[PDB]
UniProtKB/Swiss-Prot annotation, chain A:
Keyword Phosphoprotein: no
Gene (name only): rpoB
The protein's name in its UniProt record: DNA-directed RNA polymerase subunit beta
Quaternary assembly: In cyanobacteria the RNAP catalytic core is composed of 2 alpha, 1 beta, 1 beta', 1 gamma and 1 omega subunit. When a sigma factor is associated with the core the holoenzyme is formed, which can initiate transcription.
InterPro entries listed in its UniProt record: DNA-dir_RNA_pol_bsu_ext_1_sf, DNA-dir_RNA_pol_bsu_external_1, DNA-dir_RNA_pol_su2, DNA-dir_RNAP_su2_dom, DNA-dir_RNAP_su2_hyb_sf, RNA_pol_bsu_bac, RNA_pol_bsu_CS, RNA_pol_bsu_protrusion
Lineage: Bacteria, Bacillati, Cyanobacteriota, Cyanophyceae, Synechococcales
Protein source organism: Synechococcus elongatus (strain ATCC 33912 / PCC 7942 / FACHB-805)
One GO MF term attached to the UniProt entry: ribonucleoside binding
Keyword terms: DNA-directed RNA polymerase, Nucleotidyltransferase, Transcription, Transferase
GO cellular component, one term: DNA-directed RNA polymerase complex
Catalysed reaction, written as an equation: RNA(n) + a ribonucleoside 5'-triphosphate = RNA(n+1) + diphosphate
Cysteine pairs bridged by disulfides in the record: none
GO biological process, one term: DNA-templated transcription
Swiss-Prot record, chain B:
Claim: Aminoacyl-tRNA synthetase is one of the keywords in the record: no
Native source organism of the sequence: Synechococcus elongatus (strain ATCC 33912 / PCC 7942 / FACHB-805) (Anacystis nidulans R2)
Location of the region described as Sigma-70 factor domain-2 in the Swiss-Prot/TrEMBL record: 82-152
Segments passing through the bilayer: none
Compartments where located: Cytoplasm
Alphabetized UniProt keyword annotations: Cytoplasm, DNA-binding, Sigma factor, Transcription, Transcription regulation
Residues of the full protein shown: 86 to 321 of 399
Residue span of motif Interaction with polymerase core subunit RpoC: 106-109
Chain intervals for the UniProt region annotation (Sigma-70 factor domain-3): 161-231
Role played: Sigma factors are initiation factors that promote the attachment of RNA polymerase to specific initiation sites and are then released. This sigma factor is the primary sigma factor during exponential growth.
GO CC annotation terms, alphabetical: cytoplasm
UniProt-recorded name of the protein: RNA polymerase sigma factor SigA1
From Swiss-Prot, chain C:
Enzyme class: transferase
Portion of the full-length sequence here: 5 to 375 of 624
Chain sites annotated for binding Zn(2+): 66, 68, 81, 84
Source organism: Synechococcus elongatus (strain ATCC 33912 / PCC 7942 / FACHB-805) (Anacystis nidulans R2)
UniProt GO cellular component terms: DNA-directed RNA polymerase complex
Protein name, entry field: DNA-directed RNA polymerase subunit gamma
Keyword Repeat tagged: no
Known cofactor(s): Mg(2+); Zn(2+)
EC number(s) reported in the record: 2.7.7.6
Alphabetized UniProt keyword annotations: DNA-directed RNA polymerase, Magnesium, Metal-binding, Nucleotidyltransferase, Transcription, Transferase, Zinc
Amino acid sequence: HLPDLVAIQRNSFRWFLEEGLIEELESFSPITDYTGKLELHFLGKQYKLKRPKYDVDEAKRRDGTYSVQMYVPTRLINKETGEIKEQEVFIGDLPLMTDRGTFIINGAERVIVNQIVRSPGVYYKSERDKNGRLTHNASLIPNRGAWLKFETDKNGLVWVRIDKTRKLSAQVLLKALGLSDNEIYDKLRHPEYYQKTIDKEGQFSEDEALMELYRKLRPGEPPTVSGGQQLLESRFFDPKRYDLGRVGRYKLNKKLGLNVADTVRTLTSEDILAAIDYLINLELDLGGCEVDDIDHLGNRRVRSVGELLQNQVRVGLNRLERIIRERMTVSDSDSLSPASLVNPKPLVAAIKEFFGSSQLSQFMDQTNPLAELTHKRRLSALGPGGLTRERAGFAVRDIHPSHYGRICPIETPEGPNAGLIGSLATHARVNDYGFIETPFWRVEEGRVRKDLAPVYMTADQEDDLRVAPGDVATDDAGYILGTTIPVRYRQDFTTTTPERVDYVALSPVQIISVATSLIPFLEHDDANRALMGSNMQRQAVPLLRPERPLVGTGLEPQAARDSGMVITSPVDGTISYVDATHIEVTADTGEKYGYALQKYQRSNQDTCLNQRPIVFEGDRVQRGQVIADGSATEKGELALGQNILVAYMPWEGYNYEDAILISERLVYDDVYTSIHIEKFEIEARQTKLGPEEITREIPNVGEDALRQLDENGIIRVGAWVESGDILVGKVTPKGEARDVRDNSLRVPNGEKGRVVDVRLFTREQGDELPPGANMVVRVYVAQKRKIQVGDKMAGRHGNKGIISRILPCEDMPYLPDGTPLDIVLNPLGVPSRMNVGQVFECMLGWAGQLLDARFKVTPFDEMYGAEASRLTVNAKLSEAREQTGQPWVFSDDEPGKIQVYDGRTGEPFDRPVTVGRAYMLKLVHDKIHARSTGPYSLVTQQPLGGKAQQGGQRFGEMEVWALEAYGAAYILQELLTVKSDDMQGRNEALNAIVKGKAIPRPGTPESFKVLMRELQSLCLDIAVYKASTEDYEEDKEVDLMA
Amino acid sequence: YTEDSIRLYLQEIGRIRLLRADEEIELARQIADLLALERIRDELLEQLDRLPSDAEWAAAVDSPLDEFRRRLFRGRRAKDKMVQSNLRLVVSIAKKYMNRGLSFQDLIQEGSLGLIRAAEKFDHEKGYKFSTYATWWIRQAITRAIADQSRTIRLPVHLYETISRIKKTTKLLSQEMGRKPTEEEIATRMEMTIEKLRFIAKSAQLPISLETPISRLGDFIEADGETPEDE
Amino acid sequence: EQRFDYVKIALASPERIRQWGERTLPNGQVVGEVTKPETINYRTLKPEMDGLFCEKIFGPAKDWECHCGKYKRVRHRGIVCERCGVEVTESRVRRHRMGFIKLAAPVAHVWYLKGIPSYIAILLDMPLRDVEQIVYFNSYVVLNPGNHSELQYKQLLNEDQWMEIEDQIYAEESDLEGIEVGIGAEALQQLLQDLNLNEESEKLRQEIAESKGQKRAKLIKRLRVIDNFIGTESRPEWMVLNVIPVIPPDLRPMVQLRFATSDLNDLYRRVINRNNRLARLQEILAPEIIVRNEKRMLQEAVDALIDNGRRGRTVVGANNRPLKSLSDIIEGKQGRFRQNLLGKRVDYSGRSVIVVGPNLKIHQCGLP
DNA sequence: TTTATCCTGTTAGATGGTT
DNA sequence: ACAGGATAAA
Ligand SMILES: [Zn+2]
């Protein structure tokens, strides 16, 4: 029943376009100047949108932005003359969301992450003193504005703490609001508890209430009744400085039991009085009151691109209104038109900053369709309005019993981000208030009603019901089998009779995410290794020829149709034209449909985004049939790895501690080979001496290194570039003909491949070049990488490894039919890591190879039998043995093990080993780095860090401690001075090494001198001294800086 | 005992009552008397090549030293009160540029110099309110201060005016042609070479800080020097 | 065998700061005072003459090359030019020479003002709040009780109280003579100059003998600070700054990528701008409130330079992030000590993935 | 010659912050 | 912000 997987990103932009921008335009529409003579009205319900310029593909290839222009009709009304100059004003450029849920910013694909925050409303908490009683406090939190904290003291006093200032009894706040004693006495249910506070703090009247409120809020100024009134109005009553939100109003009404309208979004007297009454009742234990949990998913909200955009637009609109008022009052003449009145710079700047430089808009993860899909379904607890890494602690990063079916309990990062970034579950969705829901089937008298439609439900809703998991087994029609059924009641796990079950989850995979739903035999794995496998499935690399798994899980065809790289025919007809770049299908009786395929493009992670056709010319095609496929799909469905022959046994030390031994067939059969495209850039700037020229007249170079340039100084498409090869030839006008200097762009060390695209952008051609540049040349270089020693290989069950040896196929162990293996894995890593599912898939994959079949096993498949996975695997293996005719395929004494021989000697190993077909993936990432001498830092004169600039390795203080414990003094002193920042000892050491002499003694490193200068610059007279040798002499200050 | 400094300055300001027009006229007359006396003293300074003593200065006005000194005092106090009671006007004008490169407190202190100059050049005989003449000087002082103290690489005032005219011409061409003007079109309209326009665009940039997150920018910039290898 | 034996740190006197920054020229002119808040010229990309990157103060931008271009090449070594007076030498001296800034009004070093032990407060035997109010121009202090009866030495006076005292002192029948009040860091400097360390030490010792409890502990702390000042032979008024040092320009580099600038340039520019404006206000006899507000601004600017955000609000940059002041450089995990002195990035180093070599010996490794 | 850079003045009235 | 005037540096 899986709906659109990337719908949290669409619904929020469809909402922004439909009723999100309108509400923010109308909320600021009536602009009036101070004299009250001119008024600008923004008829924001009629904002039209101009069609996007360029195109999606043109924007991508030009390195531009995919956006539209917003025009709102306005009317400037003169309060007296009455002349109304109606017009349409330009408001801004809005980047548009593509059909896949992403945005195209500066020619790069970006995605707006979803933020899990605390929902607006009122939250109660009870705190216990070291020796005192329980004291209760309440926090009122709006969508945007100031917080309102209430607190109960140990003596029975009620205090209010506006913002973070000092407390003030609630009587001041209630009287300042304009409430007499009778109304606040009647609304409260237990009035003597507040009467104690009234008596202790004295009954304030409205005038003195406002006086004291002003005095406490803004000390040092003379109190003024009007001053206080205005302070309160600006703090909690100003529609443009305090917003509860629709969700805030909903939560306030739901919690406090009020009935206020949904349109009012500011605090009202009723609200504060109710909140106080609830606090009093919670203090007195009335019965219908309860403290709040802040980690509950019923008290937490999700914000997506629509809300975050709305907020940025609001800020820009506030700035725009300030500019409009400034450029409206100054004018002494009504010669202004609405076009000349509005300035779209603040709004454009706000939108640009949000989409380019915010920490909620993120560079897309595009290694494969799975990473892309799970990047759009990601929920973050960090950002402008959430948490910070140093403030998030143990409680926040854990699993809350309310995450069941809404947030995956497996898929998270490892390290500082563990528990702070999560993934939406498979069936979960976000409603229009911002709370995550999840679907259930109704159960009537123990019968599951799959005829009726799924009932979605939020975390707070499903607390009074008894909800059964999706792995419960029902008989014909719908009745639940068994006598005891596990259920969840009030965030607890219990068991009940199946006549008292209220709801049942829709699927057994309703609790996990999409990446974790792609792991077969998941219930036989540990959760840590399941996390590892799910995370590593999103680092797999699209291969040269992808291949479907044999033991897939059933969600592969659905995890690939949302990335928008598979083409399916919407029409039940015939195919008339097939090409490497074009497909055409003629409807049985109708129009022709034509599709264009992307070819060897480049993703954010330098992988390849190819697209290939599947069908042939003159082929009968049905609707919904796969027509083209992506770089990580075979025929409809995800394909991230390959199926290879695997044996579980140790080699001669090459399997040691997660190392991997593979065969040479994986190299010459083009298994686990991939295409990676990199981008290099060169800039022609304008120096004070003169401009920079791209030409082949490069100094100090021979014609043997200008073979592949295009008589303009730029390499040619289709040329093979090795390391250090010139890509674009550039000359700079240095100041000291023989005057040009060479800073042409060359391939970095360790890079090679073919040149596939050389795009040029110059201001003449109508391109948006940087401020000081006069030519931007971009070169794309592609290469094919094979599996090799040092690469990371992985499986779906969390088993990672680094390849340490590649054996010729006559050295690898072979089967009783002569087939050498493809990979040998150490079994020592299986039982200590509890990822037994890898031993099931292999075996089933073995059967799948032998029976020319493909198995779709769904996780948690043991609801049908006592041991369903083992029985299915054994039955499949026996069936394969009977169909093939070879008895060595399957043995009854050792089911999963068969005899294997040694390729080096021809002798069989002592005992049979487990062999099968395993689905392994090749992970991304270019890490090898070395340095002798290179660039140095500006202040400290220490080597730079980074592979791209010949950087050094850091010798931290733990390494200094390690060298101190060894007793090493000369290695340490050489590391600290001669090899880092002894500005004069570096050259002497290098010269001594080159000449062959001895390295001289070092001096004082430059960082110490920098520190002494900084300390002197802090008004400290710190200095270095040389002690006097004889008696009647003074110590002499030593000059280091010489 | 607040920690805010601007609020403390606003409180110190509020302890002063606004002047009335007759008070302005009286103070303007005393200010003019003080100015004339100062001019005379300056004349004595040119004649003596030294600061005149109070006795020599009093002698230059044929005035008893006591009368002269008291007149001088009255004039000083008059100018002091004229500036003091208008600091509120200075704040009211200075609040309109709080996001241009100078902090709010810097805008206030720079507009105070303009207010002092305005109080030094106000003419009661003109028959105008001091709040009209002083506004020009306050605005001029603040604008000049922004032009001369807002950037690390300071640009001359003529460059700011050139950039403003370039923006206005670009907006006018965009309105006229209904599209974003090209570089050549703008250069022709401005009657200046395209290289000059690019130079203006390059010099208008704000310097990026070394500590911009990338991790900071300052850790990715090499150092000027001769590589140990090249020696 | 070693160049230096021990590192000694003491309280910097204004004479020492001037010595650090003042260097004489063959023409007889002394240089080392930064007078203009100008870093570099926008068109020539050449440092100004009396700014934060001056070549006459810090050193030539290009080694063996004059600012005006009169002298070039090594041949002219130690030849200070005449047209602009720049020393034709190596540019490396731009990271060793300091220069100074002379302040129109004295300021307080925030380290000795806002610390866990407040040395200014401890020496003056005053609460920290009173000292802060005096420094930041929120209250007056009675530098001399004079002849008044209800006024005590080192007593805080509000503005209204000081106005009442003014009315009393300007009454035709007042016998009141010799009363003095002060506001700002100048008052703190006068109070610090008043302290006679020997007599204070003797009095505190005598009082400590006849004391116990928390009173004894507080007098012990005062005596310890006073005895430290006596031993160091340093005058406590040196905690109030009259001149400040300028860090060498290469330690606050202004490189061109756009121009990337250190936050120290902006902090120094704020200090110089406020100091110059204060000098102008003191030259035209501005109203007292304007001058006092400018002095408060100068104090805040020096505070933000020494340690940003310690006392008042935090000075943000172009983006809403704190500017990195002098104190932020030498502290924290990213500070100088832990990032560049106790651990460094070294040359002749590499990094790579590790695989298992089973045929290697225990004393061998496989290197690509 | 021709700009690049600095200096001075401006008359309706206006008079305490945002985030 | 904008206009006029003085000057020196390119
Ligand atoms: Zn010179």
